[PDB]
Design a binder for this molecule. Structure first.
Ligand SMILES: Nc1ncnc2c1ncn2[C@H]1C[C@H](O)[C@@H](COP(=O)(O)OP(=O)(O)OP(=O)(O)O)O1
Ligand SMILES: Nc1ncnc2c1ncn2[C@H]1C[C@H](O)[C@@H](COP(=O)(O)OP(=O)(O)OP(=O)(O)O)O1
Ligand SMILES: Nc1ncnc2c1ncn2[C@H]1C[C@H](O)[C@@H](COP(=O)(O)OP(=O)(O)OP(=O)(O)O)O1
Ligand SMILES: Nc1ncnc2c1ncn2[C@H]1C[C@H](O)[C@@H](COP(=O)(O)OP(=O)(O)OP(=O)(O)O)O1
Ligand code: NA
Ligand code: NA
Ligand code: NA
Ligand code: NA
Ligand code: NA
Ligand code: NA
Ligand code: NA
Ligand code: NA
Ligand code: NA
Ligand code: NA
Ligand code: NA
Ligand code: NA
Ligand code: NA
Ligand code: NA
Lengths: 480, 478, 478, 478
């Protein structure tokens, strides 16, 4: 077994070490071929047919490019061949825990189906990796290539999920601290997983990427920052890092939080909720699990993919009728209808515990307009979206270290005022989208009146088309 | 009316007329989201995750670009808005009849499972379109936009599948319209243009054909008393390059030796599953994977999903099918032994395919072997590579015009273009694989293979001297 | 004569009407082949070899795309063939007035060589267009294609340079036409769209603005009793991104610290050569590099070639000029010391520029230095970065329409889009360089520089702590 | 001094070792910024503004990629850091000897102006490199980085121009290194790889050769007791495609019929200017355009600028030269009459070129002509199109390895790959143009042309029946 070459449209011809090949050629990894990267986004951007499989190869490749580049420029770090493989494997395997339609599954479905548990795709990746290792005899193969399974497995899992609970990591000592910033960077969010999905999502969506990850890799260095070795960027690149998070935000606005993409993810979630009692997935020992409990058994979870959508759509059982009809509505494009978008003003934040009550508030509004129909709470969906630069209210560039041309081993900080006055003043905000489940012309007219009146009552921002969709409501609000 | 815009990575922002949107928003069209364009190719080229859905939008768009371009340059053709919509709809709908894994289903599975029937994806598209029309109340919507369903449905179906003037959907003065979506005269059509661009974007191989350039130089002229789409004389080199590119894409990607063996293993799994999977069709009647083609309501539910239904099954009756698919996941694939071609005049006929594994196993290589292999251990895959018209040069069926007389159609022969062009336009490739994957079986398989090539006067395999050093010295030609 | 087709790597195959071809095939237009789009940027980004000629073809093409798109969607605007040609011509001709190294010539050279005059490339374009028309017998060719030279020439010139309705080339009901080539209201025009795509292709930085998407959503609506080009409401995010991209391109490429210092050195060489180079104009009268702008026949011969005329000269009078250009070839450039910005209300006005090198040399660092530097050893470059309208948000001057009422124009404020947008739309950068390149001079230059930043309450330079560790602790702030 | 990074749109961010930087920052290298890669091609493809400078950086970078790749995969070859630098330097410097408009200068101008000498851009590069080294003190800088100037300079020059082992710069065990920059065995080298990608990016024609794939599969193996670079067996298809692409680029772009006639007109202007332009060289001695090749200090100043020096001149002695250049700006070009090829064994040798205009004018068409044309009215351009090795298949000079024995070199014949490949590897194109551009002259020129083709048994011109309907019936073949 020798180096395989694989041709990827984003990165070109990528070399895979035979241990990587052994990890890839398992049911646990190959599963990612059946999970769309962008979930319901495929129903809006028809190029976005790519799956988590190819994204994962790309993350593994880029993780290897960055660690190899640091090792060649700085031999004094003592990056070993073993370190390189562990970083590549962690890159490959950080997407293993994703579920059907990717963010739909851990962002919408699981929190509604199992409100008592705290599940992330990260934790799932660690569990799925363990199952991959143990079911496929990977440990003897790791030893053959010089890995020490005990320590290296721990290292790999820590790169995915952070400390498995003073230097908190066990897989590598503090002098290799920089290695924990490559695959999943908890300090500031700058990591190779974003770099792959920027390039890959853009190629498939038909929106062009402005971030240059190769340029970043070339200027990257390891320096001592508060007695820990960290990956630092060249001072000059600070503009480009602000542009990188600006790009992330553009991709969320244009594509990932597309108003129709989100409502399709919501409809799929609702179909999976109604189907949950009746779909059975066989796991370890022949025990049966549901869509919502497959996360408790990795053998069941292995078989939980986008296929669930089609199993529901093609079913004939009367018990799956409600689930199936929601999916049929997607095919006919009879979707829940977008009413509009607003934001809170001032320092007002809408917290997760208030979400359920928002459809009630929209239906409780009293627009002074003659209406043919009256709508209820259950007729409205309210979707609250938190947009930020990856670290809630914080500027992630405040957590980046830099070096200068004249002293490349000396780490420095650069503040927002030292770069530009044209940068954002805040780093987080909320969007509120409202939709109506009643699609007829009179219901939709009514829904707009309730919506705009609610925006006025709550002192939210004037919807962009407020004057067109509710001309009788927007004059009562002086500031509009 | 109300145009939708859709953003496609190949063509940019595409406008869809509301009638097209009505056709697209049906179970019969949306089904194409679950059929991979390149089938088992995704298992070799990981970027090739694209489905028939997006390819079909692109063919519809390009069909519209070509017909609009001809109408603007030549008002005298009388291309109406109705013609434009019919051509776009036929473009949209020519892929409706594809099955699971696209060419796998009509190229491998159906010919083995139903050898007596003559099924093509084209005929399937016509049948699926009829079912799409009748199940979704499309005829009143056609009338709303000025189409005449009787004539226009006939036109649309004829553009997909073909037929004194033999067509009924349009008269002879619109003969050129039949050359846009599916060109029976020479193979130059908008379906190829979309898949060249789209497959290349996804495979990571760069496309060298410029379809926009071609559309700009295209004109309709009278050729033997029939109006045809002609190309500019100067463009003749680019058309030879276009078929050269098609041939490269087949060699590099579509007939990739591992892509084909994965399609073969999936076919074998579907054969072993065929008795046991049921698909519900019209009136609750049950169909199999091999009979779903006889009922469009069943066939609607026949997609790549079948692969996962088999892979995830627990039924003991699906065990053999499921194990073949598990072999694909572990990459325990049937092993490639090699490739050869016939020499001289020799062509291998379709009726002799079944007997070829027997001939390879019957060869007597003078090498000491620890295993003996049988007929069933060999797969022999014969691939016909051509320029789309068997042995014919398709450029002999293209008409050209000159700058100084743009309504005068001419012919250009291969001799008038270049001496560096192909001398033949068709050939066969013979790939041999072994179902026994261990190192000793594979060694043995190579000896039988090379010996068979020697016995049959086939070409010396490229690695012949390395894989069978004891066999290749007997053959003086090599 | 009929349509020429030209293949451009940015836009593909572009069609040129024969009148445009006649305008392009003149010495006044073909001159733009010898003026680099990005001037000294080519000396930093080696892909940036592109010239104004191809950019101008692209602007003419995109001007035609937008006016055609508006006309097809809204026949009621009565856009005539004549309007289309005049808009395409204005698009083609808006770069005619550029000088050697593009922005170097009107941004640095002319203001220093002729401080008393107010010259812009725009005014130059109008004058060069008039000369192009009259020297090449274009007026009878305009008449042949239905143009009325009196009104249409006026229209074309007004589209490039601007002026109760103040325009004479078209009445108020065609007011939207003045927003295509050079948009005075908000800066959204086709010239930006071409240079975004073209500069990005050549620089190796990828463009994220989608101009085609913008064209598809564009409509003309009534706004305060005047017809204007409006954008779809949803696209407002993309317009903010468009100016954000313009700003990124300025930071990364157009105001690159070494690109600018190369433009400065070339400017200095042209100043020292100005007394001695002669350019023959109309009548045989002689002009200088700085006076060629007063005679279009001389200016026709004033291109990047002047750089090489100086570099290859042997005349002893051009020695000092030639030596500066030789320093560029050896890469012995004036050295970058650093960058800072003003804080608070502080704005640095154009009348204070000359005094800044004096202030840096007057600073008293409080560290012992081996050499002392003077005013002439420093260059101080002030760069104004904005969104095209000084302190104003250009999106406040954009009109929008909604899906439910496409003829009804609306306004959208910054708070209705996002909290993550910029709070200001203008700022200044100050770069300092040193003409003395040795290690001791450069160390000293950094101490003066950082101390000056401290004295003036400017921002702490990014590398302040590394380049001047003894100076940055004295500032209660840093 | 450490690595510079340079951003190139084709290769991305490229690292330059400080010795390379020292070679690049000289007047001898920087001169390549003023020589267009494609010469007159820019006058047809407006994207083709790129210069030899950036192409050279790219060849240097790719030379380094291939030698690094071989060294990492095969440590037993003992590729040193010194070898890597010498290979990068040879890559950087192989284009130094190009003249104004690249192939125009050594392909057209020099053969006509200096018929007694045998000059190539290769020999020019060696001479320019020597001058670069000696004028800029590069030898001590080479020693600083471990190079041995005597041996390594010889190595570098041998990699550019060529020579029982005939080379002195490296012994036989490093023989593979001579195949990277300029491969005399088969033409597969990094210079092609860069211009495929770069010319395609600028021309707007898409490249289908994947050089990175090739580098990944490349290995060094023993072939007839010499170490050589071998390709993987199954890449053989791709190598045939690589030369097919080279040929397509020649047909579409580099031998464009208008590109070539513009190169011819520029050559004619330079011939008429040759007596009157002076270029100052070493010791103040004066040279002409045609003698600047004999003094590297003069040749340093000989660039595309010469075109504009002629165009902008006022000297009455340069009038005829200047008028030809003015005709290019107005697009009053010599007119294309047509294209033919020889049939049979007939090859047209360089000594018969001068007589061809005479033969066309001597033909006796037998139709009534209003004007009669003479020899000097015709230009006949003979173009040799091949796969880089005259009549030979360059793939017969490629060595391959198989997966099962990667140190064992093999040969692969054309019949082992495909029957759809070219049957010949060389041909000639004959283009005829007319210097008289009026309608009557052009009609006459076509009659003479077609009659000449008939008399000589050349191929029927593609538009023969349209341009000469009365002449093409006499010829039974046609
Ligand atoms: N000619 C080609 N150009 C571009 N990519 C290719 C081409 N041929 C194959 N690929 C892609 C498909 C895969 O992603 C990757 C490797 O394919 P390939 O080299 O065919 O390996 P293989 O594993 O089938 O052969 P082998 O095992 O004999 O080396 O390159
Ligand atoms: N900013 C963007 N840039 C590029 N593509 C986009 C952007 N926004 C959306 N898309 C894509 C997704 C779709 O394929 C296509 C149409 O999207 P969009 O204009 O959002 O339609 P819509 O149907 O959601 O809006 P509406 O119905 O309100 O007009 O363009
Ligand atoms: N095969 C090609 N592919 C892409 N671009 C090409 C090709 N051939 C030429 N071009 C480019 C060069 C020009 O920019 C544009 C038009 O050139 P071309 O069609 O050769 O026109 P022409 O003016 O030389 O021919 P004619 O006058 O006979 O129509 O296309
Ligand atoms: N932000 C950017 N994105 C892409 N390319 C850039 C960017 N900045 C500069 N370039 C280009 C121009 C050059 O070709 C190459 C290197 O430029 P740059 O990093 O600016 O070097 P420099 O020599 O000016 O800086 P220094 O000497 O301070 O390291 O990259
Ligand atoms: Na797709
Ligand atoms: Na990590
Ligand atoms: Na530093
Ligand atoms: Na058809
Ligand atoms: Na082509
Ligand atoms: Na073929
Ligand atoms: Na296949
Ligand atoms: Na597999
Ligand atoms: Na052939
Ligand atoms: Na709207
Ligand atoms: Na260009
Ligand atoms: Na070179
Ligand atoms: Na060179
Ligand atoms: Na060998």
């Amino acid at each position: 077994d020798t180096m395989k070459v694989i041709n990827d449209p984003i990165h070109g011809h990528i070399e895979l070490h035979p241990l990587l090949v052994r990890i890839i050629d398992t049911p646990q990894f190959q599963r990612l071929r059946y999970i769309k990267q962008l979930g319901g986004g495929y129903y809006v951007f028809p190029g976005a047919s790519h799956n988590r499989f190819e994204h994962s190869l790309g993350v593994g490749y880029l993780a290897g490019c960055l660690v190899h580049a640091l090792g060649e420029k700085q031999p004094e770090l003592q990056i070993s061949e073993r370190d390189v493989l562990c970083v590549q494997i962690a890159g490959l395997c950080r997407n293993l825990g994703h579920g059907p339609f990717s963010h739909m599954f851990d962002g919408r479905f699981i929190p509604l189906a199992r409100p008592e548990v705290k599940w992330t795709h990260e934790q799932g990746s660690v569990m799925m990796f363990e199952h991959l290792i143990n079911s496929n005899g990977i440990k003897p193969v790791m030893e053959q290539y010089g890995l020490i399974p005990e320590e290296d497995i721990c290292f790999i899992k820590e790169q995915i999920v952070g400390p498995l609970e003073l230097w908190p990591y066990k897989g590598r000592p503090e002098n290799k601290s920089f290695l924990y910033e490559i695959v999943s960077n908890k300090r500031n969010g700058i990591d190779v997983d974003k770099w792959d999905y920027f390039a890959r999502d853009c190629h498939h969506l038909g929106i062009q990427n402005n971030f240059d990850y190769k340029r970043f890799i070339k200027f990257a260095r390891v320096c001592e920052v508060d007695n820990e070795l960290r990956i630092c960027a060249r001072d000059k690149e600070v503009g480009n890092l602000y542009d990188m998070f600006h790009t992330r935000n553009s991709l969320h606005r244009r594509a990932y939080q597309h108003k129709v993409g989100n409502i399709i993810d919501t409809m799929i979630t609702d179909a999976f909720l109604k189907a949950d009692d009746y779909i059975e997935i066989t796991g370890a020992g022949g025990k049966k699990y549901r869509i919502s409990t497959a996360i408790d058994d990795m053998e069941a979870y292995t078989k939980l993919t986008d296929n669930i959508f089609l199993e529901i759509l093609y079913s004939t059982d009367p018990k799956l009728k409600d689930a199936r009809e929601i999916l049929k509505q997607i095919e006919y494009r009879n979707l829940f209808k977008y009413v509009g978008e607003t934001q809170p003003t001032g320092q007002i934040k809408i917290k997760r515990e208030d979400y359920e009550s928002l459809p009630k508030e929209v239906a409780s509004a009293k627009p002074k307009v003659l209406l043919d129909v009256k709508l209820k709470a259950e007729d409205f969906i309210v979707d609250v979206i938190n947009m930020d630069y990856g670290m809630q209210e914080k500027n992630p560039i405040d957590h980046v270290s830099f070096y200068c041309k004249t002293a490349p081993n000396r780490a420095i900080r650069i503040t927002k005022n030292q770069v530009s006055q044209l940068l954002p003043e805040k780093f987080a905000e909320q969007l509120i989208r409202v939709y109506c489940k009643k699609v007829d012309r009179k219901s939709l007219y009514a829904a707009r009146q309730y919506f705009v009146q609610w925006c006025a009552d709550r002192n939210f921002t004037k919807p962009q088309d407020g004057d067109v969709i509710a001309p009788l409501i927007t004059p009562q609000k002086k500031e509009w």
